[PDB]
Amino acid sequence: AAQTNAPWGLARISSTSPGTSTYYYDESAGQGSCVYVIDTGIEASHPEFEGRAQMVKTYYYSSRDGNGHGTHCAGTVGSRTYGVAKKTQLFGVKVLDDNGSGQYSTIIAGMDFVASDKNNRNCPKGVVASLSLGGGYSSSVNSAAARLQSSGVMVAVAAGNNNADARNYSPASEPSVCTVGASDRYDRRSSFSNYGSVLDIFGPGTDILSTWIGGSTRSISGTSMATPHVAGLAAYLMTLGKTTAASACRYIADTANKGDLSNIPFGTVNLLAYNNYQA
Ligand SMILES: [Ca+2]
Ligand SMILES: [Ca+2]
């Protein structure tokens, strides 16, 4: 399949070079996989989700996404126009309030919720969780992310937006998950992206068009936007049978575009997520 005039990040993850505009992908499109978006919620009624999104848990008064951030991330995972894995199932877990903030105890609870809830869901191609959130280092937060991964979920987490070493942020600093930095459409490390030895991969994160609340769309930037590209790529590759939840981060790193990015500090991987789709 080939989506013309796609958002630049979708085109980028199907090309060895920057500057293209078509997203080339296998039509299976993540069918049969499931992605939990652990965030401010998902506006499941958005036409771009085509009935494939639903809220499964909220830690606040409502399950509504009153912010937009979670809806945007979910759209990059799996919306029709803006998503990597256009046929995946999306499950929303609202651990962040409508200002985009959440206490670590609640974020931890949401991770352990996913680890259990996936045993209620029919996800024959496997389960992914996308965590476009974080704060300062916390061993408890890291341990929760490690448990979620251990339980059989491909966990992708944002590196953070501090232009600093991700070792000092959580869940970014948990080794066993997939820690995602951000790049721009000229293959530069995004100006805000964290870096460091703990990063596994980069994805598109500057000026990413996706869904928003009120049935709308907008373009925003962050490692929060790079993370769902990787989560959606994992779901897509799992549906194709190329990898598993335990091995997908390593597989994505194996198969990434290597050495394409600029302003990568020595000791940080120079790896950009790539679907290696060959029609
Ligand atoms: Ca290249
Ligand atoms: Ca890792």
Side-chain angles (χ1 to χ4, degrees), residues 13 21 24-25 30 34 61 86 126 128 131 150 163 177 195 202 207 222 232 242 247 252 264 267 275:
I13 68 163
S21 60
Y24 304 95
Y25 62 97
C34 301
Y61 309 99
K86 298 175 187 302
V128 181
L131 286 65
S150 167
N163 186 35
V177 301
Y195 53 81
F202 284 80
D207 299 330
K242 292 175 176 289
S247 55
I252 288 168
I264 299 295
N275 72 3

Tab-separated table of all heavy atoms in Angstrom, residues 13 21 24-25 30 34 61 86 126 128 131 150 163 177 195 202 207 222 232 242 247 252 264 267 275:
chain	number	residue	atom	x	y	z
A	13	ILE	N	9.494	6.875	7.895
A	13	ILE	CA	9.732	5.527	8.391
A	13	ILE	C	9.589	4.480	7.300
A	13	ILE	O	9.816	3.301	7.580
A	13	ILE	CB	8.883	5.200	9.631
A	13	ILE	CG1	7.421	5.123	9.229
A	13	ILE	CG2	9.163	6.194	10.768
A	13	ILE	CD1	6.577	4.440	10.237
A	21	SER	N	7.513	11.856	0.401
A	21	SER	CA	6.164	12.214	0.815
A	21	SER	C	5.160	11.069	0.772
A	21	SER	O	4.016	11.265	1.180
A	21	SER	CB	5.635	13.383	-0.028
A	21	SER	OG	5.597	13.017	-1.387
A	24	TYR	N	4.855	4.070	2.361
A	24	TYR	CA	4.743	2.742	1.766
A	24	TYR	C	4.677	1.719	2.901
A	24	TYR	O	5.573	1.687	3.747
A	24	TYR	CB	5.979	2.450	0.896
A	24	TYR	CG	6.293	3.459	-0.221
A	24	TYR	CD1	7.192	4.507	-0.025
A	24	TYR	CD2	5.728	3.324	-1.488
A	24	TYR	CE1	7.480	5.411	-1.048
A	24	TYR	CE2	6.014	4.221	-2.509
A	24	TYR	CZ	6.889	5.256	-2.285
A	24	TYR	OH	7.172	6.144	-3.295
A	25	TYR	N	3.639	0.871	2.916
A	25	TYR	CA	3.441	-0.069	4.013
A	25	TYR	C	2.638	-1.275	3.546
A	25	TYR	O	1.818	-1.181	2.629
A	25	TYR	CB	2.733	0.611	5.202
A	25	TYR	CG	1.344	1.135	4.874
A	25	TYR	CD1	0.216	0.397	5.176
A	25	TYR	CD2	1.164	2.362	4.246
A	25	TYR	CE1	-1.056	0.847	4.859
A	25	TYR	CE2	-0.106	2.829	3.922
A	25	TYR	CZ	-1.209	2.073	4.234
A	25	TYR	OH	-2.468	2.541	3.918
A	30	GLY	N	-1.065	-3.677	10.796
A	30	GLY	CA	-1.258	-3.909	12.212
A	30	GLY	C	-2.566	-4.561	12.609
A	30	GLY	O	-2.878	-4.621	13.804
A	34	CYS	N	-2.853	-4.930	19.179
A	34	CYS	CA	-3.494	-3.962	20.049
A	34	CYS	C	-2.435	-3.044	20.621
A	34	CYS	O	-1.352	-3.508	20.994
A	34	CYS	CB	-4.203	-4.655	21.211
A	34	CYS	SG	-5.488	-5.832	20.704
A	61	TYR	N	-12.101	11.741	36.781
A	61	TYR	CA	-13.551	11.801	36.911
A	61	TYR	C	-14.238	11.319	35.654
A	61	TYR	O	-15.332	10.750	35.726
A	61	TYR	CB	-13.959	13.240	37.206
A	61	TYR	CG	-13.182	13.832	38.354
A	61	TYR	CD1	-12.098	14.656	38.125
A	61	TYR	CD2	-13.514	13.539	39.670
A	61	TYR	CE1	-11.368	15.183	39.169
A	61	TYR	CE2	-12.799	14.061	40.715
A	61	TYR	CZ	-11.726	14.882	40.467
A	61	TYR	OH	-11.031	15.396	41.539
A	86	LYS	N	-2.492	1.320	10.593
A	86	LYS	CA	-3.801	1.903	10.325
A	86	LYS	C	-4.966	0.972	10.622
A	86	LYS	O	-6.116	1.427	10.567
A	86	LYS	CB	-3.860	2.389	8.881
A	86	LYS	CG	-2.844	3.479	8.584
A	86	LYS	CD	-2.854	3.852	7.111
A	86	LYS	CE	-1.748	4.811	6.719
A	86	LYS	NZ	-1.792	6.084	7.492
A	126	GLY	N	-0.445	-9.657	19.133
A	126	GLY	CA	0.342	-9.138	20.232
A	126	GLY	C	-0.097	-7.754	20.674
A	126	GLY	O	-0.983	-7.118	20.098
A	128	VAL	N	1.106	-3.910	22.460
A	128	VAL	CA	2.062	-2.817	22.572
A	128	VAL	C	1.489	-1.798	23.548
A	128	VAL	O	0.270	-1.648	23.655
A	128	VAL	CB	2.265	-2.175	21.178
A	128	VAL	CG1	3.274	-1.038	21.202
A	128	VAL	CG2	2.661	-3.230	20.145
A	131	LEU	N	3.886	5.074	25.840
A	131	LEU	CA	3.977	5.909	27.040
A	131	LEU	C	4.688	7.223	26.698
A	131	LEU	O	5.894	7.375	26.913
A	131	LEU	CB	4.718	5.170	28.151
A	131	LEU	CG	3.978	4.044	28.878
A	131	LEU	CD1	3.647	2.861	27.989
A	131	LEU	CD2	4.828	3.530	30.004
A	150	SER	N	7.899	-7.162	30.874
A	150	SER	CA	8.058	-8.553	31.285
A	150	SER	C	6.769	-9.342	31.080
A	150	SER	O	6.807	-10.533	30.737
A	150	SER	CB	8.492	-8.577	32.760
A	150	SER	OG	8.379	-9.879	33.307
A	163	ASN	N	16.604	18.105	26.297
A	163	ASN	CA	17.917	18.209	25.658
A	163	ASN	C	19.017	17.789	26.624
A	163	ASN	O	20.030	18.468	26.785
A	163	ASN	CB	18.161	19.610	25.101
A	163	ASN	CG	19.450	19.710	24.314
A	163	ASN	OD1	19.856	18.769	23.626
A	163	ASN	ND2	20.097	20.868	24.395
A	177	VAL	N	12.827	-1.422	28.411
A	177	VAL	CA	11.796	-0.958	27.492
A	177	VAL	C	12.458	-0.321	26.276
A	177	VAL	O	13.690	-0.335	26.147
A	177	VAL	CB	10.801	-0.024	28.201
A	177	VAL	CG1	10.150	-0.777	29.359
A	177	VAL	CG2	11.455	1.270	28.652
A	195	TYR	N	18.884	12.416	24.930
A	195	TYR	CA	19.876	11.564	24.297
A	195	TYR	C	20.465	10.675	25.386
A	195	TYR	O	19.985	10.659	26.522
A	195	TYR	CB	20.930	12.432	23.581
A	195	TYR	CG	21.532	13.482	24.484
A	195	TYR	CD1	22.553	13.161	25.364
A	195	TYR	CD2	21.051	14.785	24.485
A	195	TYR	CE1	23.080	14.112	26.218
A	195	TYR	CE2	21.575	15.741	25.331
A	195	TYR	CZ	22.582	15.398	26.197
A	195	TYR	OH	23.101	16.361	27.031
A	202	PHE	N	15.414	6.387	17.446
A	202	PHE	CA	14.767	7.663	17.183
A	202	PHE	C	13.573	7.457	16.258
A	202	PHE	O	13.569	6.563	15.403
A	202	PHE	CB	15.735	8.657	16.521
A	202	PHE	CG	16.717	9.256	17.485
A	202	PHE	CD1	17.844	8.548	17.883
A	202	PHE	CD2	16.496	10.510	18.028
A	202	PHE	CE1	18.720	9.098	18.801
A	202	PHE	CE2	17.362	11.053	18.942
A	202	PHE	CZ	18.474	10.350	19.326
A	207	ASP	N	7.130	18.586	14.463
A	207	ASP	CA	6.069	18.997	13.529
A	207	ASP	C	5.316	17.795	12.962
A	207	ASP	O	5.285	17.558	11.750
A	207	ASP	CB	6.598	19.903	12.413
A	207	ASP	CG	7.196	21.187	12.936
A	207	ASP	OD1	6.757	21.680	13.992
A	207	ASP	OD2	8.110	21.706	12.275
A	222	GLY	N	7.499	16.733	19.945
A	222	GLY	CA	7.956	16.164	21.199
A	222	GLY	C	8.478	14.761	21.003
A	222	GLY	O	8.169	14.076	20.022
A	232	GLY	N	3.540	2.115	16.952
A	232	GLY	CA	2.806	1.672	15.783
A	232	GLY	C	3.644	0.797	14.868
A	232	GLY	O	3.142	-0.181	14.306
A	242	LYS	N	7.123	-10.648	11.966
A	242	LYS	CA	8.565	-10.468	11.881
A	242	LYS	C	9.234	-10.426	13.240
A	242	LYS	O	10.440	-10.671	13.334
A	242	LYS	CB	8.878	-9.205	11.084
A	242	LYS	CG	8.503	-9.365	9.617
A	242	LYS	CD	8.683	-8.094	8.814
A	242	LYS	CE	8.384	-8.328	7.342
A	242	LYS	NZ	9.430	-9.157	6.688
A	247	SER	N	10.942	-8.925	21.591
A	247	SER	CA	12.087	-8.723	20.722
A	247	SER	C	11.940	-7.532	19.786
A	247	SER	O	12.898	-7.207	19.076
A	247	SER	CB	12.384	-10.010	19.922
A	247	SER	OG	11.246	-10.462	19.209
A	252	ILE	N	13.631	-3.537	15.702
A	252	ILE	CA	13.561	-2.193	15.140
A	252	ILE	C	14.948	-1.567	15.095
A	252	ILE	O	15.336	-0.964	14.089
A	252	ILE	CB	12.520	-1.355	15.913
A	252	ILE	CG1	11.114	-1.859	15.559
A	252	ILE	CG2	12.667	0.132	15.625
A	252	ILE	CD1	10.021	-1.331	16.458
A	264	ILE	N	23.834	13.981	16.918
A	264	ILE	CA	23.748	12.853	17.843
A	264	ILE	C	25.030	12.841	18.670
A	264	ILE	O	26.117	12.658	18.096
A	264	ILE	CB	23.605	11.524	17.092
A	264	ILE	CG1	22.327	11.503	16.252
A	264	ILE	CG2	23.638	10.348	18.074
A	264	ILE	CD1	21.045	11.547	17.046
A	267	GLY	N	28.066	8.285	21.884
A	267	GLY	CA	27.502	7.378	22.870
A	267	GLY	C	25.995	7.209	22.805
A	267	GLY	O	25.439	6.382	23.547
A	275	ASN	N	10.629	0.788	8.391
A	275	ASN	CA	9.811	-0.407	8.213
A	275	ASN	C	10.370	-1.408	7.209
A	275	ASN	O	9.870	-2.536	7.159
A	275	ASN	CB	8.341	-0.073	7.910
A	275	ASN	CG	8.102	0.479	6.513
A	275	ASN	OD1	9.003	0.593	5.677
A	275	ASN	ND2	6.843	0.816	6.261
